[PDB]
């Protein structure tokens, strides 16, 4: 039977300072016991000083980041170029993820 | 589906189908609502060109929407049934989800919303009906009387009338009803309602219907003899 | 008077849009004729190519509906092609559903029923065409069935359609009074085509070259149209007699 999910491995890490924040991720991409790429980035600048990573199944991860980046673009169009605050981004991402509650994006997301 | 915009604007800014629906209300039998200190009374005209009627089974002019709210009307009788049914369904639906019966304002607002929707929906004409909605909110003793009309506007009234020759009875109520001191008792409120209908009706025999609503779902319709006593009393005081 | 614009009854029980669709039939100014042999059914039609810039091979009012059924139209080409495409689809679907080739008369009925719907339903206009269906039916033999914008249809011993239809009709009537039979008593289809052209010449009073005519022939298990040279061969035979 066809299995729609896969595991592309890797790991990510976010730390917050006083006047800064970091989001780190390794650049390895795998399937089973094989290396697909040694440099395939999964930490992205999404605009409005928001960085994002969705680690796990890379297809779902890229889909989610792509949709959020697009959500930022339409937020500008619909609300007079207003800056999307980090708390507002977080809530928006909840709705993206929960929209697929019964066929989930298999990923751990950090912004 | 039939899609035609029947209700539309004219050059002078009027929606003629809504205004012609008001003319149907003007043709309908008179209906009056008077609210007292601890009650509301709904009075209704019944035209006397119809003899050989069966009053047991003939549809009554005042309808119960729930045990604590009533609805009378003026205009097209067939149209009124559709509004009454929808209101009754919404009353039970409100009890089911909110665990509390409707307020009179809420029920009025719903009926008024239905009427409005038929003024900007394709393929339908407006309701040729204006309603008087009266009752008491749950666990409340303040009397409520509201009016609706084909356009969809609604508002609260200390006393009001609708239907044929309603302008005459509204004239009567405007001078006879004191805001500072409403009818203190049930008798006073019924009498003022009967008096106001006697300006227009003809005879006080089987032409007047009276329904009294009191707090905590206490609604009763008066019989012929009970109403006839008010008619007999008013006429004797008049000869002066 | 909006009862003349859509297909509803007038005070005298008439459908004016149907009547005006009949007048559209003659807009091309072309006359058609159909006759039956023993083994065959022949249909002929005038071919008029006024513009010199036209490719004359593409100018046609005869259509091959199925392998066995042929159709000639009297009316404008867009409506003719509409009717032709639908008849082709109907004949193909019939074969698929019921396992045998659609008969000429059954297709005629089906197209007539479709035409009827346009006379009763308001949003669809009638097609301004008369459809003459021909075949050699495996049960009924040589067959001619004709449909019109009213949704009427009937079988024919022979028939004609167009502006000068009445002259051709009476010409054929008088022949069948004389011969005392329902068909052209002739063995080969070639001579039935010769009969058809000869009687059209007599009725219309005009002579024809090879490019002035268009011919369709139905035999058992195939319907086919004749080329300019096939017609020219046929015209030579008539002339030498």
């Amino acid at each position: 039977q066809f299995n729609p999910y896969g595991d592309n491995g890797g790991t990510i890490l976010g730390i917050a300072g006083e006047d800064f924040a970091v989001l780190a991720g390794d650049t390895r991409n795998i399937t089973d016991y094989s290396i697909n790429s040694r440099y395939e980035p999964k930490v992205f600048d999404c605009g409005d000083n928001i960085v994002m990573s969705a680690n796990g199944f890379a297809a779902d991860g890229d889909a989610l980041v792509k949709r959020f980046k697009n959500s930022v673009k339409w937020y500008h169009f619909d609300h007079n170029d207003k800056k999307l605050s980090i708390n507002s981004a977080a809530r928006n991402i909840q709705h993206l993820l929960y929209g697929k509650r019964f066929f989930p994006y298999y990923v751990h997301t950090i912004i | 589906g039939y899609d035609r915009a029947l209700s539309i604007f004219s050059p002078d800014g009027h929606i003629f189908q809504v205004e012609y629906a008001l003319e149907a209300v003007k043709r309908g039998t008179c209906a009056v609502g008077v609210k007292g200190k601890n009650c509301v009374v709904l009075g209704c005209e019944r035209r006397s060109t119809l003899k050989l009627q069966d009053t047991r089974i003939t549809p009554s002019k005042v309808s119960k929407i729930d045990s604590h709210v009533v609805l009378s009307f003026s205009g097209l009788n067939a149209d009124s049934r559709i509004l009454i049914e929808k209101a009754r369904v919404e009353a039970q639906s409100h009890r089911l989800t909110l665990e509390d019966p409707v307020t009179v304002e809420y029920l009025t607002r719903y009926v008024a919303g239905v009427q409005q929707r038929y003024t900007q929906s394709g393929g339908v004409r407006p309701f040729g009906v204006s309603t008087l909605i009266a009752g008491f909110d749950p666990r409340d003793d303040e009397p409520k009387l509201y009016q609706t009309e084909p356009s969809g506007i609604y508002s609260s009234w200390s006393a009001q009338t609708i239907g044929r020759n309603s302008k005459t009875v509204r004239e009567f109520l405007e001078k006879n009803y004191d805001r500072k001191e409403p009818p203190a008792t049930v008798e006073e409120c019924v009498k003022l309602t009967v008096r106001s209908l006697l300006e227009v009706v003809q005879t006080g025999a089987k032409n007047i219907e009276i329904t009294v609503v009191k707090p905590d779902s206490d609604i009763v319709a008066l019989s012929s003899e009970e109403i006839n006593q008010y008619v007999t009393q008013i006429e004797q005081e008049k000869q002066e | 008077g909006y009862d003349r614009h859509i297909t509803i009854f007038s005070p005298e029980g008439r459908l004016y849009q149907v009547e005006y669709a009949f007048k559209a039939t003659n807009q091309t100014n072309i006359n058609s004729l159909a006759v039956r042999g023993k083994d065959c059914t022949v249909v002929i039609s005038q071919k008029k190519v006024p513009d010199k810039l036209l490719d004359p091979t593409t100018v046609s009012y005869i259509f091959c509906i199925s392998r066995t059924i042929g159709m000639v139209v009297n009316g404008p080409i867009p409506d003719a092609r509409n009717a032709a495409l639908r008849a082709k689809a109907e004949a193909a679907e019939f074969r698929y559903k019921y396992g045998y080739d659609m008969p000429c008369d059954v297709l005629a009925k089906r197209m007539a029923n479709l035409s009827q719907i346009y006379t009763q339903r308001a949003y669809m206009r009638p097609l301004g065409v008369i459809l003459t269906f021909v075949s050699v039916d495996e049960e009924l033999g040589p067959s001619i069935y004709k449909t019109d914008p009213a949704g009427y249809y009937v079988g024919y011993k022979a028939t004609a359609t167009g502006p000068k239809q009445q002259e051709i009709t009476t010409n054929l009537e008088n022949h069948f009074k004389k011969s005392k039979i329902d068909h052209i008593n002739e063995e080969s289809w070639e001579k039935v085509v010769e009969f058809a052209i000869t009687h059209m010449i007599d009725a219309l009073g005009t002579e024809f070259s090879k490019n002035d005519l268009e011919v369709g022939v139905a035999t058992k298990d195939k319907f086919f149209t004749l080329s300019a040279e096939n017609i020219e061969e046929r015209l030579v035979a008539i002339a030498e007699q």
Binding site: - | - | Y16, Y20, L53, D55, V59, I77, P78, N82, G128
Partner: protein, 243 residues
């Protein structure tokens, strides 16, 4: 009367006045032609230069369908584009199911039936274009002209728009003088001349020439635009003939 107020209504003549009114919009438009040749077809069109501010070579009117069919039209330009968009869908579904690219007669009837469908109902308007189109298929070269009624025929030469009568007359001379046939490279040059001659009926604004062609030998059976040296050569040929 009132028979002309609604599409799909027969007049007492047996005519659809709304379709005839759409023909008037076609007659108002710029001139466009089609020339059938030995192993292909040539298309050409008049583009009126309304202003100096129009970018030359960058308001293309001739359209390609699939890879082997060219379409040009006169009248309401947007209606033409709508028809080509349909043509492209029809050609794509034909190739999808039957593998082979759509034959030109097959393609002609697909447009014909679609245009004819817009004369059947009062809820739609007829097309305000006459469309000249064609190309090369398995059976050789084909040229067609399609009208607002849905009527179409095959043509040796075709013309439509404001200068149609001038172009038709010039086309009729080519058919008479070349019974064996005209070559593809010749037809391009003749197309330029005929557009320049047909421009006499629209001579207030000066114009821009646009030519395309399909040819089994010259373009390998595909639709291409005539540009650069071959275009300027055809313009110079046309300039020499008017003087």
């Amino acid at each position: 009367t009132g028979y002309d107020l609604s599409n799909s209504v027969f007049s007492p003549d047996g005519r659809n006045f709304q379709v005839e009114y759409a023909v008037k919009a076609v007659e108002n438009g710029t001139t466009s032609i089609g020339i059938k040749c030995n192993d292909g077809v040539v298309f050409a069109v008049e583009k009126l230069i309304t202003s100096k501010l129009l970018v030359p070579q960058k308001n293309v009117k001739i359209q390609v369908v699939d890879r082997h069919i060219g379409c040009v039209y006169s009248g309401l330009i947007p209606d033409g584009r709508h028809l080509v968009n349909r043509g492209r869908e029809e050609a794509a579904s034909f190739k999808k199911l039957y593998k082979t690219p759509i034959p030109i007669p097959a393609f002609a009837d697909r447009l014909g039936q679609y245009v004819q469908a817009h004369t059947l109902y009062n809820s739609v308007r007829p097309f305000g274009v006459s469309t000249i189109f064609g190309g090369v298929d398995k059976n050789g070269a084909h040229l067609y002209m399609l009208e607002p009624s849905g009527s179409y025929w095959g043509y040796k030469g075709a013309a439509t728009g404001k200068g149609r009568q001038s172009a038709k007359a010039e086309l009729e001379k080519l058919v008479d003088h070349h019974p064996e046939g005209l070559s593809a490279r010749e037809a391009v040059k003749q197309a330029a001349k005929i557009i320049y001659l047909a421009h006499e009926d629209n001579k207030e604004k000066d114009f821009e020439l646009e030519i395309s062609w399909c040819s089994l030998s010259e373009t390998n059976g595909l639709h291409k635009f005539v540009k650069g040296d071959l275009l300027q050569e055809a313009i110079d040929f046309a300039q020499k003939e008017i003087n």
